[PDB]
From Swiss-Prot, chain A:
Described function: Catalytic core component of RNA polymerase II (Pol II), a DNA-dependent RNA polymerase which synthesizes mRNA precursors and many functional non-coding RNAs using the four ribonucleoside triphosphates as substrates. Pol II-mediated transcription cycle proceeds through transcription initiation, transcription elongation and transcription termination stages. RNA-dependent RNA polymerase that catalyzes the extension of a non-coding RNA (ncRNA) at the 3'-end using the four ribonucleoside triphosphates as substrates. An internal ncRNA sequence near the 3'-end serves as a template in a single-round Pol II-mediated RNA polymerization reaction. May decrease the stability of ncRNAs that repress Pol II-mediated gene transcription.
Parent-record interval covered: 148 to 196 of 1174
Species per Swiss-Prot/TrEMBL record: Homo sapiens
Transmembrane segments: none
Protein name in the entry: DNA-directed RNA polymerase II subunit RPB2
Top-level taxon of origin: Eukaryota
Annotated localization: Nucleus
From Swiss-Prot, chain B:
Listed InterPro entries: RNA_pol_su_RPB10, RNA_pol_suN_Zn-BS, RPABC5/Rpb10
Complex and partners: Component of the RNA polymerase I (Pol I), RNA polymerase II (Pol II) and RNA polymerase III (Pol III) complexes consisting of at least 13, 12 and 17 subunits, respectively. Pol I complex consists of a ten-subunit catalytic core composed of POLR1A/RPA1, POLR1B/RPA2, POLR1C/RPAC1, POLR1D/RPAC2, POLR1H/RPA12, POLR2E/RPABC1, POLR2F/RPABC2, POLR2H/RPABC3, POLR2K/RPABC4 and POLR2L/RPABC5; a mobile stalk subunit POLR1F/RPA43 protruding from the core and additional subunits homologous to general transcription factors POLR1E/RPA49 and POLR1G/RPA34.
GO terms of biological process kind: regulation of transcription by RNA polymerase I; transcription by RNA polymerase I; transcription by RNA polymerase II; tRNA transcription by RNA polymerase III
A single cellular component GO annotation: RNA polymerase I complex
Gene name of this polypeptide: POLR2L
Protein family per UniProt: Belongs to the archaeal Rpo10/eukaryotic RPB10 RNA polymerase subunit family.
Location relative to the cell: Nucleus; Nucleus, Nucleolus
Species of origin: Homo sapiens (Human)
Name the record gives this protein: DNA-directed RNA polymerases I, II, and III subunit RPABC5
Curated annotation (Swiss-Prot), chain C:
Phylogenetic classification of the source organism: Eukaryota, Metazoa, Chordata, Craniata, Vertebrata
Domain of life: Eukaryota
Gene assigned in the entry: GTF2B
Residue positions, PTM Phosphoserine: S64, S70
ZnF TFIIB-type span: 5-36
Domain notes: The TFIIB-type zinc-binding domain is necessary for the interaction and recruitment of RNA polymerase II to the core promoter, the formation of a fully competent pre-initiation complex (PIC) assembly and basal transcription initiation. The C-terminus is necessary and sufficient for interaction with the TATA box-bound TBP complex and for the formation of PIC.
Species for this entry: Homo sapiens
Family: Belongs to the TFIIB family.
The protein's assembly and partners: Found in a ternary complex with TATA box-bound TBP. Part of a TFIID-containing RNA polymerase II pre-initiation complex (PIC) that is composed of TBP and at least GTF2A1, GTF2A2, GTF2E1, GTF2E2, GTF2F1, GTF2H2, GTF2H3, GTF2H4, GTF2H5, GTF2B, TCEA1, ERCC2, ERCC3, TAF1, TAF2, TAF3, TAF4, TAF5, TAF6, TAF7, TAF8, TAF9, TAF10, TAF11, TAF12 and TAF13. Associates with TFIID-TFIIA (DA complex) to form TFIID-TFIIA-TFIIB (DAB complex), which is then recognized by RNA polymerase II (Pol II). Found in a RNA polymerase II initiation complex. (Microbial infection) Interacts with HIV-1 Vpr.
Protein name: Transcription initiation factor IIB
UniProtKB/Swiss-Prot annotation, chain D:
Function: Core component of RNA polymerase II (Pol II), a DNA-dependent RNA polymerase which synthesizes mRNA precursors and many functional non-coding RNAs using the four ribonucleoside triphosphates as substrates.
Pfam (any one): RNA_pol_L_2
Annotated family: Belongs to the archaeal Rpo11/eukaryotic RPB11/RPC19 RNA polymerase subunit family.
Tree of life domain: Eukaryota
Protein name: DNA-directed RNA polymerase II subunit RPB11-a
Subcellular location: Nucleus
Record key words, sorted: Acetylation, DNA-directed RNA polymerase, Nucleus, Transcription
Main location: nucleus
Disulfide bridge partners, by residue number: none
GO biological process: transcription by RNA polymerase II
């Protein structure tokens, strides 16, 4: 074990990607959210291009 | 989320006519005519019911069989 | 006037002195005689700015340096 | 909220007074009526009833600002017929005319319709 | 460092000693309110109750003030504090029996503002001296500062959510000084350019020209209603311009009541109408497009920006020099009130209808566009043959670029002139342009006729790509559309190239606006 | 007084919801004000006080209180028996100036439940219920006749609250409206030129402009005045149309009478230049 | 912590090798309205000197056609230095040239 | 008197009326919710 | 199925094209730019 | 080119350009080039055929997709360097017209022109009848129009959130919005709007509003603010604790009442709070004894640092959550809900960036009514139109009128052959209105008709985050900066 890497939401390593509309709705995470943003210390943090 | 009782503009109650509209469109495809059979003769009321979005259903969908 | 500590009520000996934060005044419950020397947590005054550019904080005038793990600061 | 209670739009206060009458000084036999806590609804119709009367020289009303429910009516009549009497007659006649409308309406309603209940 | 803390902005001198934050201040959104005088401002009850003014007790006002202490603080027209001559300041919320706190001459009472105290009202950035002026407060419901619409102009306020700052002076000496010097009625004619710094604007400005037209007649009933709003009416209703068949007052006639029976303006008339330089003098149909005021009565001609507006020679300016600021101030409030109410029966609007024209006009315009486009091909054909012959003060490229620009400008101007003519009298769009309310001839040209050649940095669209402006065009195409001419109009939509080229030219306006505010702010500062 | 202009009425059409009529030989100001009264001054009963015990719906608390306010109430019973809350000797509320409503529902089934006016009941005797399914469904079925979906619930969610309906009127809050709307028109041929048409041929003739059927479009008359006003009031369901108009006229009559009694009181003491 | 720090603060580098060259590259996702969130995720930024450099890197260059939204910049300060992709736009993730 | 503390996602009360850890027994979640008061609140329908 | 030989009417009403465009957004994210880079 | 279209070279990641006047060919496979999809046209015809379209419709049960479409090699991704070399055609129409036109050499074709627009410029209807800076102004205001922003907002505790009660999907839509899920989650309301001067309370970028509409719930919204507070050991001899602070023991004595708190130390869901009430009672036990010689009495063992209002006049406590944070400490979030009703001072905008403040509101009685009696919900001043030239504002409106009568949602696609002026006006007359939107309006105060007919009809409007109660402010004495002795920042 070498460190902890922040995960960008609903990318291939964020566990939400493998689930369908009903499953995300069951997890209490909105199906229509776009994702792609990091979550750090309780805040969703998005990078600017 | 959920139809506004009475149309903002005029006053005509418009929750009494909601589910009947959705039912009729599922049965019969003639949305202009469907509004007419429902009785909303006038376009302020027609935008009300016509352009409303039922968001309540996504909310009911959540796991929340708890809150 | 070295006996301050908040017992400076001339008309009658004090029991409690109340801080009306919004008015910036020190008030006494059972008469009426402000005695201002308004401390408004004076600690609040450096933390006043926010809407002006910060993040990097150019207007900072002191690092916390964590003193309660160190004899020297 | 800075906004007023909604009833404040019509409800008279314990200290305020429903009407006040003050005389003009610019021209003879003229008067100015102030009605407090009222709207265009009363003012507009009474102004019209006074104009209908041929002994009224001038009659008019305005509300000075919409956020402070108050109306004023200026009336001027010939120097032999008080503006107070004209104001009284115009109202009483209007009540009578409305009552005739009211009576004639119910009778019209009665006529053959069995769905009036 | 110590030097840095002292330095510039937010430094001890400039950002702090020379300009400190102050106490007794209020700030909120603004909304328009025709019903206020000019030098009035409406103030929210919450803002009026929270802020305070120190009256000193005299023998002859003591009883009223004692009542004010008795109202306490919990209800609006009360008092915050009472200060003893000894130096004691006393709160009026904690003490259980204010009645037991008997007042006497020499105490100061800090009471809530009430209808009639004077404040400095201000909009930053404060560009000139008329941007900060004294006003009378007027307390009313809901939470914005409400200010008469004609005061927008010196301030540059556009109730699109602009803020204002309010400041309340405390002593009688600063109240007298503000009241005498800073007051809005004193601010009417500007020393910068000896003209009236505030004129009639927006609807009142459109509604007045429409009202002064000699086609307008009012029944006895509607004349009474307008007379009812007027403040300084004499009480005598003027002799109707038409006695029979039925009694009628003309628009100009009722307007003659709202001006102070003394102002004597001649000329100021210059609407487009009548003619340019000599037509009315051919025969003297004394006409109706030229305004004449005598003995304080509008004799003939309709009103606009030229008569009624900020122009140095106006009804407002001549009245100010002649009648004096207090009479000009009742004249400003009155003109809006009589004119807003008449508008209230009349109405004013603008639909798509005011922007559409007739079939013949479009065929004529399109035929005008087809001629100009053919001519540009003609210049290009002449240019490629190497027979164009450069103008004596340019290169061959510059002559071509000058020449096509001359033709494409000439084209827009012909079709533009054609639409203004093809329009009728009822077009509300023409009513807004002609009164001088908003917009311009070129605006009319753009919505209905044709938008024309977009620009950047003073020349046609650049070759962003190698010898092209967009990938959609052929290389080295010097025609109109390819170099950024917009052939259609905002009423008929734009094509994709035009939309993108229009977007380039709209941007140049955004960058200029952003930069300009900084350099002017700095150049101004160096001068003072 | 010699100038009172009679004012005749004629009723064209009457249904459960509409009242269509013409008033003639009266003034425009009477016409406009009687219309203003139909919206603002007609009293009615509506929910006005709501207290929520437990609310687990997927909709927040004031949202529910709001929806409850707007439901119409069958005030067929003379709302005059029910006095205004301000005037009544009682502390806060009572049966003599209030009606009481109560709602308790929970979703025990696995399928989604709808909350409607039939579940909301008047503790007060059945004379002042909600508009849905009371005096009858009118052979004209509104499939569910649910009046309004107040909210939706699922397994485990529940809603328990109380509500107090009171008399109030339209110029206070929109809920106290006896009208869904009111049509109003006068002089449909523009004989009086109170509106001025550019290109008069592009305007569609109105339902009452059919008199000359002529495509000539608006014959002028310069000695005319307003005459013959056309109304069409439509009820929201809270009160039968003719009963709204009659209540409006009388209430306005009470209102003017009050101004007379105040005016007489002013001249009860000092004459104040009465003559 | 070194990555967690950079993402949280917005600063650049491990702090020892400066931070001012890539200031504000990281942000708290705005969510005022679904269009707002969706717009911030599609934001594009363009580096400059600070507060007053007027030149060509601020206006609408012709090559933006179809990449960057033609009409959508902040209304002040950075009035052209903050761009947004159009809708069809893409950004190549890169690949081995081998 | 107890303070209920409705659990994360099982919503069985945990009767936390002391200085004990806010972890809900049986259910692994550890975020809470204080529950609506029995105290009544009035809303005008306006 | 397509053959580029028996075809005689290659035209098609470019109001059809939203079906092509939808298949773009329906497949691609609306915000792939972010996601593909982090995956890479 | 043949290999890249054959998938032997990674299409999206490889650009390939030839610059023939310098006789060199550069190829790029690096990251960070912006590229877009385009149709490949060959032999002066489309390479994409109707067979593919029917294959795309087939996907409701077929596995055929966009990636299959690229592999057919009928579309390519073209970056800006390569876009410099192509001969791009605007539409298949022009590509047909070429038999008379100047160019017959096209290589690529636009899949549709409105795609040159980014997300916010895509919510706005008929943008080309807008004078170009208006489109920039809306795209900004569009981020500030509040709406329901995700659907699971009931279990989120965003620091600050704004939700509208009754969003509605835009009566007149742009085709693009079908892919922004904008229909699912709207931003404003379909309002009934009139362009009139009225009693002139709406001069200069403001609006007259229908009070009965704000009352029937129109643009009513809820506002949530979330407060978080942490306990923290934060030192060797400091303790923070949630408790009910008392003047018998604690040191803070702030006159704010502590009575509303629960015994735990923070208030429970449903309680009403105001601009003085304490939401959470935290205290900091600090000196433990470092004041020797009977320094107990009271207000000694611990100081107060609890969190309470200063903020606003506020509303009702929605939710209170006790949990623990990343550090392990006991941590709280408390959400406070308020219901904002549109009032003089709030800011709104239509989709053309016609932003504006509310100048006054009138009850249904006063608003000028039509034949039916449709009283406007908003009156925008006519003068906002001519200098600003958002004609699109009028076109959206006229189109929205036809949609309300037909009952069919319209279509504000910015580039089509729908000759919008003539065609819509013809449809609108057929429904029985004046063909160009005017309606004979009546005056609410006197019943007389308005002499000019008023352009009246529906338009999508937005409520903004800038509510007026948030921005109001004032001072009298108050806090002093003793490092400077002047008043505080704001
Ligand atoms: Mg301005
Ligand atoms: Mg302005
Ligand atoms: Zn209607
Ligand atoms: Zn009672």
């Amino acid at each position: 074990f070498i460190g902890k890497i922040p995960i960008m939401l609903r990318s291939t390593y964020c566990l939400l990607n493998g689930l369908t509309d009903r499953d995300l709705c069951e997890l209490n995470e909105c199906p229509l959210d776009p994702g792609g943003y990091f979550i750090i210390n309780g805040s969703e943090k998005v990078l600017i291009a | 989320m959920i139809i506004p009782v009475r149309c903002f503009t005029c006053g005509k109650i418009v929750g009494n006519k909601w589910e009947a509209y959705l039912g009729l469109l599922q049965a019969e495809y003639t949305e202009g005519d469907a509004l007419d059979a429902l009785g909303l003769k006038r376009y302020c009321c027609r935008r009300m019911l016509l352009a409303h979005v039922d968001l309540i259903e996504k909310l009911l969908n959540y796991a929340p069989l708890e809150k | 006037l070295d006996a301050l500590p908040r017992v400076t009520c001339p008309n009658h000996p004090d029991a409690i002195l109340v801080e009306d934060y919004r008015a910036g005044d020190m008030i006494c419950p059972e008469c009426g005689l402000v005695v201002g020397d308004r401390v408004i947590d004076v600690g609040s005054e450096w933390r006043t700015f926010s809407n002006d550019k910060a993040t990097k904080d150019p207007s900072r005038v002191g690092d916390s340096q964590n003193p309660l793990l160190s004899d020297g600061d | 909220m800075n906004a007023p209670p909604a009833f404040e739009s019509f409800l008279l206060f314990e200290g305020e007074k429903k009407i006040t009458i003050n005389k003009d000084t610019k021209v003879p036999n003229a008067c100015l009526f102030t009605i407090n806590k009222e709207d265009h609804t009363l003012g507009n119709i009474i102004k019209s009833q006074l104009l209908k009367d041929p002994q009224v020289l001038f009659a008019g009303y305005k509300v000075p600002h919409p956020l402070e429910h108050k109306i004023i009516i200026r009336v001027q009549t010939t120097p032999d017929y008080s503006p107070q009497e004209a104001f009284t007659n115009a109202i009483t006649d209007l009540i009578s005319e409305l009552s005739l409308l009211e009576e004639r309406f119910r009778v019209a309603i009665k006529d053959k319709q069995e769905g009036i209940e | 460092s110590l030097k840095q803390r002292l330095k510039g902005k937010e430094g001890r001198v400039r950002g702090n000693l020379m300009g400190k934050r102050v106490d007794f201040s209020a700030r909120t959104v603004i909304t328009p309110d025709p019903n206020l005088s000019i030098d009035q401002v409406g103030v929210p009850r919450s803002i009026a109750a929270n802020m305070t003014f120190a009256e000193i007790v005299t023998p002859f006002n003591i009883d009223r003030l004692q009542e004010l202490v008795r109202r306490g603080n919990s209800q609006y027209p009360g008092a915050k504090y009472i200060i003893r001559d000894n130096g004691d300041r006393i709160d009026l919320r904690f003490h259980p029996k204010p009645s037991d706190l008997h007042l006497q001459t020499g105490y100061k009472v800090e009471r809530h503002m009430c209808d009639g105290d004077i404040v400095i009202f201000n909009r930053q950035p404060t560009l000139h001296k008329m941007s900060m002026m004294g006003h009378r407060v007027r307390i009313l419901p809901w939470s914005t500062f409400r200010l008469n619409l004609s005061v927008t102009t010196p301030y540059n306020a556009d109730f699109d959510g602009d803020e204002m700052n309010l400041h309340l002076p405390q002593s009688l000496e600063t109240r007298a000084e503000i009241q005498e010097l800073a007051m809005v009625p004193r601010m009417i004619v500007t020393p910068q350019s000896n003209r009236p710094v505030m004129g009639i604007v927006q609807d009142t400005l459109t509604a007045v020209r429409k009202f002064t037209k000699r086609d307008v007649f009012l029944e006895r009933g509607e004349v009474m209603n307008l007379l009812m709003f007027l403040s300084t009416w004499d009480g005598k209703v003027p002799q109707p311009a038409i006695l029979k068949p039925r009694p009628l007052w003309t628009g100009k006639q009722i307007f003659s009541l709202i001006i102070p029976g003394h102002i004597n303006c001649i000329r100021t008339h210059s609407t487009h109408p009548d003619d340019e330089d000599s037509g009315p003098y051919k025969h003297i149909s004394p006409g109706d497009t030229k305004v004449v005021v005598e003995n304080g009565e509008l004799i003939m001609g309709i009103l606009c920006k030229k008569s009624l507006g900020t122009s140095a020679g106006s009804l407002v300016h001549i009245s100010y020099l002649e009648m004096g600021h207090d009479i000009t101030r009742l004249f400003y409030s009155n003109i809006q009130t009589v004119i807003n109410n008449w508008l209230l029966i009349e109405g004013h609007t603008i639909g798509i209808g005011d922007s559409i024209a007739d079939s013949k006009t479009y065929q004529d315009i399109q035929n005008t566009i087809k001629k100009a486009k053919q001519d540009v091909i003609e210049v290009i054909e002449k240019a490629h043959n190497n027979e164009l012959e450069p103008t004596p003060g340019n290169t061959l490229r510059q002559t071509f670029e000058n020449q096509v620009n001359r033709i494409l400008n000439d084209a827009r101007d012909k079709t533009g002139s054609s639409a203004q003519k093809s329009l009728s009298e009822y077009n509300n769009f023409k009513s807004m342009v002609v009164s001088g309310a908003k917009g311009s001839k070129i605006n009319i040209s753009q919505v209905i006729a044709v938008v024309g050649q977009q620009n950047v940095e003073g020349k046609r669209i650049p070759f962003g790509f190698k010898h092209r402006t967009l990938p959609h065009f052929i290389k080295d195409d010097y025609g109109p559309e390819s170099r950024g001419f917009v052939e259609n109009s905002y009423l008929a939509g734009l094509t994709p190239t035009e939309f993108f080229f229009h977007a380039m030219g709209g941007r140049e306006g955004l960058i200029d606006t952003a930069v300009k505010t900084a350099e002017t702010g700095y150049i101004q500062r160096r001068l003072i | 007084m010699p100038y009172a202009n009679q004012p005749t009425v004629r009723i064209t059409e009457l249904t459960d919801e509409n009242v269509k009529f013409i008033i003639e030989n009266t003034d425009l100001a009477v016409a406009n004000s009687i219309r203003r009264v139909f919206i603002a001054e007609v009293p009615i009963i509506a929910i006005d006080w709501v207290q929520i015990d437990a609310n687990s719906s997927v909709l927040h608390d004031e949202f529910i209180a709001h929806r409850l306010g707007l439901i119409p109430l069958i005030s067929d019973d003379i709302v005059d028996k029910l006095q205004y809350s301000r005037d009544c000797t009682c502390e806060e509320f009572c049966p003599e100036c209030s009606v009481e409503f109560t709602l308790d529902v929970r979703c025990n089934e696995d399928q989604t439940r709808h909350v409607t006016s039939r579940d909301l009941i008047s503790n007060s005797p059945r004379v002042i219920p909600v508009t849905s399914r009371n005096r009858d469904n009118d052979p004209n079925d509104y499939v569910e006749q649910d009046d309004i979906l107040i909210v939706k619930l699922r397994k485990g969610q529940e809603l328990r609250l109380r509500a107090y309906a009171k008399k109030g009127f339209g110029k206070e809050h929109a809920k106290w409206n006896p009208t869904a709307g009111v049509a109003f028109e006068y002089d449909p041929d523009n004989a009086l030129r109170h509106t001025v048409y550019p290109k008069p041929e592009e305007w569609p003739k109105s339902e009452y402009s059919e008199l000359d059927e002529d495509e000539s479009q608006a014959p002028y008359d310069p000695n005319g005045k307003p005459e013959r006003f056309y109304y069409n009031v439509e009820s929201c369901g809270s009160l039968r149309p003719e009963t709204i108009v009659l209540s409006a006229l009388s209430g306005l009559k009470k209102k003017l009478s009050d101004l007379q009694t105040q005016l007489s009181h002013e001249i009860q003491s000092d004459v104040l230049t009465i003559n | 912590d070194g990555l967690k720090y950079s993402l949280a603060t917005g600063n650049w580098g491990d702090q020892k090798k400066a931070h001012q060259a890539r200031a504000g590259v990281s942000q708290v996702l705005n969510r005022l309205t679904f269009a707002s969130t969706l717009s911030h995720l599609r934001r594009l930024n363009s580096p400059i000197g600070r507060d007053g450099k007027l030149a060509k890197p601020r206006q609408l260059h012709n090559t933006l056609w179809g990449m960057v939204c033609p009409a959508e910049t902040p209304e002040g300060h950075a009035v052209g230095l903050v761009k947004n992709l159009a809708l069809m736009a893409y950004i190549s993730v890169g690949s081995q040239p081998s | 008197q107890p303070m209920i503390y409705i659990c994360g996602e099982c919503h069985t009360e945990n009767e936390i009326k002391s200085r004990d850890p806010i972890r809900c027994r049986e259910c692994g979640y550890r975020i809470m919710y204080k529950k609506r008061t029995k105290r009544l609140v009035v809303f005008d329908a306006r | 199925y397509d053959e580029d030989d028996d075809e005689i009417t290659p035209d098609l009403w470019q109001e059809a094209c939203w079906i092509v465009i939808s298949s773009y957004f329906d497949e691609k994210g609306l915000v792939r730019q972010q996601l593909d880079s982090f995956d890479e | 080119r043949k290999l890249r279209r054959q998938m032997d070279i990674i299409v999206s990641e490889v650009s390939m350009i030839r610059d023939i006047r310098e006789r060199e060919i550069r190829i790029y496979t690096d990251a960070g080039r912006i590229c877009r999809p385009l149709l490949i046209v060959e032999k002066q015809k489309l390479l994409l055929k109707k067979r593919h379209i029917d294959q795309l419709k087939e996907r409701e049960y077929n596995n055929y997709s966009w990636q299959d479409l690229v592999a057919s090699g009928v579309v390519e991704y073209i970056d800006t360097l390569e876009e410099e070399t192509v001969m791009l055609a605007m539409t298949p129409d022009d590509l047909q017209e070429k038999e008379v036109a100047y160019c017959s050499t096209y290589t690529h074709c636009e899949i549709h022109p409105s795609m040159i627009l980014g997300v916010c410029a895509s919510i706005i209807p008929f943008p080309d009848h807008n004078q170009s800076p208006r489109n920039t102004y809306q795209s900004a205001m569009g981020k500030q129009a509040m709406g329901v922003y995700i659907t699971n907002f009931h279990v989120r505790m965003d620091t600050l959130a704004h939700v509208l009660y009754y969003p509605q999907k835009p009566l007149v839509t742009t085709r693009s919005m079908e892919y922004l899920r904008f229909r699912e989650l709207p931003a404003g309301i379909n309002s009934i709007v009139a362009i009139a001067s009225y009693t002139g309370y709406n001069q200069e970028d403001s609006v007259i509003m229908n009070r009965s509409a704000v009352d029937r719930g129109f643009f009513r919204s809820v506002f949530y603010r979330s407060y978080k507070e942490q306990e923290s050991k934060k030192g060797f001899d400091q303790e923070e604790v949630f408790e009910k602070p008392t003047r018998e023991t604690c040191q803070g004595m702030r006159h704010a009442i502590y009575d509303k708190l629960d015994d735990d130390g923070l208030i429970a869901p449903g309680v009403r709070v105001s601009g003085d009430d304490v939401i959470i009672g935290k205290t900091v036990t600090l000196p433990e004894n470092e004041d020797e010689l009977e320094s107990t009495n009271r207000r000694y063992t611990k100081r107060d640092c609890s969190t309470f209002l200063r903020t606003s006049e506020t509303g009702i406590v929605d939710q209170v959550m006790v949990t623990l944070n990343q550090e392990g400490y006991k941590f709280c979030k408390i959400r406070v809900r308020s219901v904002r009703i549109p009032q003089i001072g709030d800011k709104f905008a239509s989709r053309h960036g016609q932003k504006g403040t509310c100048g006054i509101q009138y009850r249904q009685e006063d608003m000028p009514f039509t034949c039916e009696g449709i009283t406007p919900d908003i009156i925008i001043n006519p003068h906002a139109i001519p200098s600003r030239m958002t004609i699109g504002h009028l076109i959206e409106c006229l189109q929205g009128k036809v949609s309300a009568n037909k009952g069919e949602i319209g279509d504000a696609t910015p580039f089509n052959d729908a000759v919008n002026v003539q065609k819509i006006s013809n449809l609108l007359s057929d429904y029985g209105y004046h063909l160009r939107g005017n309606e004979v309006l009546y005056n609410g105060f006197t019943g007389r008709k308005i002499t000019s007919q008023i352009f009246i009809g529906p338009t999508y409007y937005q409520r903004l985050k800038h509510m007026v109660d948030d921005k109001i402010h004032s001072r009298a004495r108050g806090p002093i900066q003793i490092l400077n002795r002047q008043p505080m920042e704001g």
